[PDB]
Short mmCIF file of C-alpha atoms in Angstrom, two decimals:
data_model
loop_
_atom_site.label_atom_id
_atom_site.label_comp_id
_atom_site.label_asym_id
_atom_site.label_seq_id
_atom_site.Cartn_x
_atom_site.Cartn_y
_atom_site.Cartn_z
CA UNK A 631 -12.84 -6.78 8.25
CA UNK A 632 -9.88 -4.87 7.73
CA UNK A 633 -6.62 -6.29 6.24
CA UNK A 634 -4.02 -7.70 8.75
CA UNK A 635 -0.24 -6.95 8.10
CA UNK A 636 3.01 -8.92 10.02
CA UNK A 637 6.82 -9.30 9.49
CA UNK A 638 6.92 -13.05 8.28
CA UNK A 639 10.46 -15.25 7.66
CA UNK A 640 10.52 -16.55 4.11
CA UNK A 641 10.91 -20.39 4.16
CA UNK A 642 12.37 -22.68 1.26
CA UNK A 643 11.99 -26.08 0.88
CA UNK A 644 14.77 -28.52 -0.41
CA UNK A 645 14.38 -32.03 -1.66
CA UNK A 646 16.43 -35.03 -2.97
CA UNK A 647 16.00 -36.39 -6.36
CA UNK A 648 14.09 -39.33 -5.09
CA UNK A 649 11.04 -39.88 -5.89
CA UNK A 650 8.86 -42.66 -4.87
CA UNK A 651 5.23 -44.09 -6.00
CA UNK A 652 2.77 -46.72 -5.77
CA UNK A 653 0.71 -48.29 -8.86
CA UNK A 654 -0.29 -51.11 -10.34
CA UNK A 655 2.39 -52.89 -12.23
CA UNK A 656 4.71 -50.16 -11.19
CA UNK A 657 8.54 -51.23 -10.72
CA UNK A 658 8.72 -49.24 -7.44
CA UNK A 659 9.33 -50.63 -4.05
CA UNK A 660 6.67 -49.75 -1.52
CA UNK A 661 8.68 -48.87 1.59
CA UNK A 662 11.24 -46.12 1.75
CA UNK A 663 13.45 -45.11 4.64
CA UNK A 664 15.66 -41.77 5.74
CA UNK A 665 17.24 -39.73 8.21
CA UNK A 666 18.12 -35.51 8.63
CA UNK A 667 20.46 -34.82 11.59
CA UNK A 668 19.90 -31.15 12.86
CA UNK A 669 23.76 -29.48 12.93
CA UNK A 670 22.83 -25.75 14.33
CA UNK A 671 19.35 -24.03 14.94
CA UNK A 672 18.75 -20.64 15.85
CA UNK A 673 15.58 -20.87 17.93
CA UNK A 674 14.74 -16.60 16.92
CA UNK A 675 16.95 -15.12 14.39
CA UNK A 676 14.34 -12.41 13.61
CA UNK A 677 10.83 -11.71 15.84
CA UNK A 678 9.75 -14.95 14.58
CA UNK A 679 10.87 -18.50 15.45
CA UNK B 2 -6.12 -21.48 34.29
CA UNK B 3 -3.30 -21.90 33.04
CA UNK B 4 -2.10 -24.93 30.97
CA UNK B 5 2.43 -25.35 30.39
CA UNK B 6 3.50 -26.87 27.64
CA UNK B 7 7.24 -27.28 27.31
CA UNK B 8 8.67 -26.33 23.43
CA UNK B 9 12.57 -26.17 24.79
CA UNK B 10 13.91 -27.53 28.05
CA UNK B 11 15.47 -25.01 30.30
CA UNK B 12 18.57 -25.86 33.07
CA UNK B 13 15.79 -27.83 34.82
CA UNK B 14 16.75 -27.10 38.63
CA UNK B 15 16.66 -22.78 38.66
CA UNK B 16 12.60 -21.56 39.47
CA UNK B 17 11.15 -17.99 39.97
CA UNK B 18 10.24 -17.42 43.35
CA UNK B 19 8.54 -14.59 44.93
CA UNK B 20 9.95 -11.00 44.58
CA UNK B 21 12.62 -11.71 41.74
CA UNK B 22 12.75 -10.32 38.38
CA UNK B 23 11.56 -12.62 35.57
CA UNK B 24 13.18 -11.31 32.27
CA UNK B 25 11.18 -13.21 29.38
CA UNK B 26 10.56 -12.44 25.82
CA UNK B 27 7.47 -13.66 24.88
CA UNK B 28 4.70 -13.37 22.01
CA UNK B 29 0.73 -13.55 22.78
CA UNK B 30 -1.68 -14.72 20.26
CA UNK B 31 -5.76 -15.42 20.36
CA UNK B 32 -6.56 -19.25 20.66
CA UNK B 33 -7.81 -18.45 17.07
CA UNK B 34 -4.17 -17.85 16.12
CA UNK B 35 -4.19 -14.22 15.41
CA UNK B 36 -1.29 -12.48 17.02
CA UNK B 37 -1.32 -9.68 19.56
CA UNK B 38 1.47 -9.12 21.23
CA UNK B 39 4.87 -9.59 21.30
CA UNK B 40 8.68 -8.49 23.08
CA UNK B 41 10.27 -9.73 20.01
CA UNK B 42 9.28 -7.11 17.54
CA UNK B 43 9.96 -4.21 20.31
CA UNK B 44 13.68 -5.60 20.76
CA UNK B 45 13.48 -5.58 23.81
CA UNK B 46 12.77 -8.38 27.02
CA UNK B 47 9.97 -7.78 29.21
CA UNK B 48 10.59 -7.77 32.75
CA UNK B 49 8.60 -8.01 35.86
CA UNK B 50 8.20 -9.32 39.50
CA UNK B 51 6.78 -12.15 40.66
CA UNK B 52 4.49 -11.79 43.28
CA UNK B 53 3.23 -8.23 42.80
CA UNK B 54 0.99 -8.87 40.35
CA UNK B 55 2.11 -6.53 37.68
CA UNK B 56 1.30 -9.08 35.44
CA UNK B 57 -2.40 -11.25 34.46
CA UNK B 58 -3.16 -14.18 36.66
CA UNK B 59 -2.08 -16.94 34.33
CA UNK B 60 1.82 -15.27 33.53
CA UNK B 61 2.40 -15.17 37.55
CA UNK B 62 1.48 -19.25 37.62
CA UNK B 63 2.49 -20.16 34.34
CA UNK B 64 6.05 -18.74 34.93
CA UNK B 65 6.52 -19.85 38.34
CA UNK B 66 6.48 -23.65 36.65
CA UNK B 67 9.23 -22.52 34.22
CA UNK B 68 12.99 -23.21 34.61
CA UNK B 69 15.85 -20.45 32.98
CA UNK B 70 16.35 -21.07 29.75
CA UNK B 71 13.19 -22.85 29.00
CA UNK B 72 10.76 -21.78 26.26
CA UNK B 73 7.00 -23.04 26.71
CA UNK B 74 3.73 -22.52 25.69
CA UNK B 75 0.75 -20.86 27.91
CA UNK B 76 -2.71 -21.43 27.59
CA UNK B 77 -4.60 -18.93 29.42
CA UNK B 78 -8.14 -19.60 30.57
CA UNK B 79 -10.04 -16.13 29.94
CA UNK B 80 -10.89 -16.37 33.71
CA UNK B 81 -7.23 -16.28 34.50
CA UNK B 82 -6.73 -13.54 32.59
CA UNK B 83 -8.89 -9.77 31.02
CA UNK B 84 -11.82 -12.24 31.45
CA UNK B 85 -15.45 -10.80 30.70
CA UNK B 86 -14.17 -6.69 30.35
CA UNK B 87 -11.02 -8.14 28.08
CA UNK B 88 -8.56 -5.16 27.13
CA UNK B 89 -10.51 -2.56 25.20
CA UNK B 90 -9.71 -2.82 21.38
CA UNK B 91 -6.91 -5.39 21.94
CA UNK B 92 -8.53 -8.49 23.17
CA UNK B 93 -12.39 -9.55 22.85
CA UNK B 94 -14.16 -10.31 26.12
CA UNK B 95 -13.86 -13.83 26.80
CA UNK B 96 -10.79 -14.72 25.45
CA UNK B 97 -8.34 -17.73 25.94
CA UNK B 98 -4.91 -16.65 25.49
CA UNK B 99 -1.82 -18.33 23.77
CA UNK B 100 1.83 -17.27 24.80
CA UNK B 101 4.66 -18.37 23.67
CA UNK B 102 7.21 -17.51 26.79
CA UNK B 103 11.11 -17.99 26.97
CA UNK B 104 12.54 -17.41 30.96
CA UNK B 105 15.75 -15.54 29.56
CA UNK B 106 17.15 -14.76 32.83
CA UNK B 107 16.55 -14.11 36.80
CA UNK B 108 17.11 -10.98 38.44
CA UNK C 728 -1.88 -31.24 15.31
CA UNK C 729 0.92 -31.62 18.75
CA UNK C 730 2.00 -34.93 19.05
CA UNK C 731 3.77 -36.86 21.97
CA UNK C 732 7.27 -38.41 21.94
CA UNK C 733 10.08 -38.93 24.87
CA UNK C 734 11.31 -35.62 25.56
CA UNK C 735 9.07 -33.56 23.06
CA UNK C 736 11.24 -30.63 21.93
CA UNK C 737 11.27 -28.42 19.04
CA UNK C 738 14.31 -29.55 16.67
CA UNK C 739 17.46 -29.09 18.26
CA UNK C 740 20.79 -29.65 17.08
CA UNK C 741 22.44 -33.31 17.32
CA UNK C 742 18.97 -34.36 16.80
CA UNK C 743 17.82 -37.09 14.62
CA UNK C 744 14.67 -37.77 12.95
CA UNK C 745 13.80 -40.68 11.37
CA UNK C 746 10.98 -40.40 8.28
CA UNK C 747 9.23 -43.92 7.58
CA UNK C 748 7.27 -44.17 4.58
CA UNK C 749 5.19 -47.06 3.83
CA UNK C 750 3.02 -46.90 0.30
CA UNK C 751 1.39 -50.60 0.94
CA UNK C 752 -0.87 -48.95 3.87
CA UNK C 753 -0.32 -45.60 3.44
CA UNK C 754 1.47 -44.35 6.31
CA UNK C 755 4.15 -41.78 7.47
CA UNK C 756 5.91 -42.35 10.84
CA UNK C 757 8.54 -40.20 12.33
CA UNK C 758 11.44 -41.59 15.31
CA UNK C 759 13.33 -38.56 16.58
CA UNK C 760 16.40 -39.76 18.60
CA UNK C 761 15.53 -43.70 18.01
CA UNK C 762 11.93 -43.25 19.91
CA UNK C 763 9.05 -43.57 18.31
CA UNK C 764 6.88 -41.05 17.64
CA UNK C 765 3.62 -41.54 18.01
CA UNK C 766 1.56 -40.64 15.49
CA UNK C 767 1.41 -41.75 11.44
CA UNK C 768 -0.47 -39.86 8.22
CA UNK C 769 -2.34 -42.39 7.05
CA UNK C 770 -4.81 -42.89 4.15
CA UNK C 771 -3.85 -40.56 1.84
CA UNK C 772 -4.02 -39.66 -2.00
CA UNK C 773 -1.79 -41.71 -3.76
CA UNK C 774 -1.83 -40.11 -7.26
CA UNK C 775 2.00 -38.60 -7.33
#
């Protein structure tokens, strides 16, 4: 019933310009492939993971 | 009761044993999801004894399964745990428990 | 939805992960550290 409040970590996404699709008669390949390697992770910088 | 699921390996090879000081930070939440409790937004770890009981059934054997250093997630059966009373205000009666535990240090 | 892989761990650094996307099926598969992990998305909207 009554409204909940929390500390919460703002999160932002990030993207490549790549962008993929599937119709028909499209000029797109159908099978796409890549890799992220992980450099440094704070597991709790704040209360939160 | 109690269910261990590993989120972070610890050292692998240091265990709890009976009458030492287990200094965790952890952060309880409702098997619904809704959050609780938590050492984390105090600042501060939580620390306690093995053996004495200071602590809900499913901490003392959930614990005594973790290595230093390793973070892993609890699942508390109710009956392991507040059970049919529950804590008053806190936690419902008949409750399964969620805790998300990190073995900081022995002492 | 937890899924099972050699060594499950949350993201660590000098970790890997591998994103497979396949539009003939649809699917999604993951590899962290070369091994496969398994589960896939599959059967999903395809207007985008």
């Amino acid at each position: 019933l009554l409204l909940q409040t929390n500390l919460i970590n703002y999160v932002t996404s990030i993207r490549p310009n790549i962008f993929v699709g599937r119709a028909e008669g499209s000029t797109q390949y159908g099978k796409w492939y890549f890799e992220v390697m992980v450099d440094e992770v704070v597991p709790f910088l704040t209360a939160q993971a | 009761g109690v269910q261990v699921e590993t989120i972070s390996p610890g050292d692998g090879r240091t265990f709890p044993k009976r009458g030492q000081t287990c200094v965790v930070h952890y952060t309880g939440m409702l098997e619904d999801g809704k959050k609780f409790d938590s050492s984390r937004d105090r600042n501060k770890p939580f620390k306690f004894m093995l053996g004495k009981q200071e602590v809900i059934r499913g901490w003392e054997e959930g614990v005594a399964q973790m290595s230093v250093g390793q973070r892993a997630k609890l699942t508390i059966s109710p009956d392991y745990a507040y059970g049919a009373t529950g804590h008053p205000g806190i936690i419902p009666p008949h409750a399964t428990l969620v805790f998300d535990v990190e073995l900081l240090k022995l002492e | 939805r937890p899924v099972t892989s050699p060594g499950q761990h949350l993201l660590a650094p000098e970790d890997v992960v591998s994103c497979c996307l396949d539009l003939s099926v649809p699917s999604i598969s993951f590899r962290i550290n070369g091994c496969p992990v398994q589960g896939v998305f599959e059967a999903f909207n395809l207007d985008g």
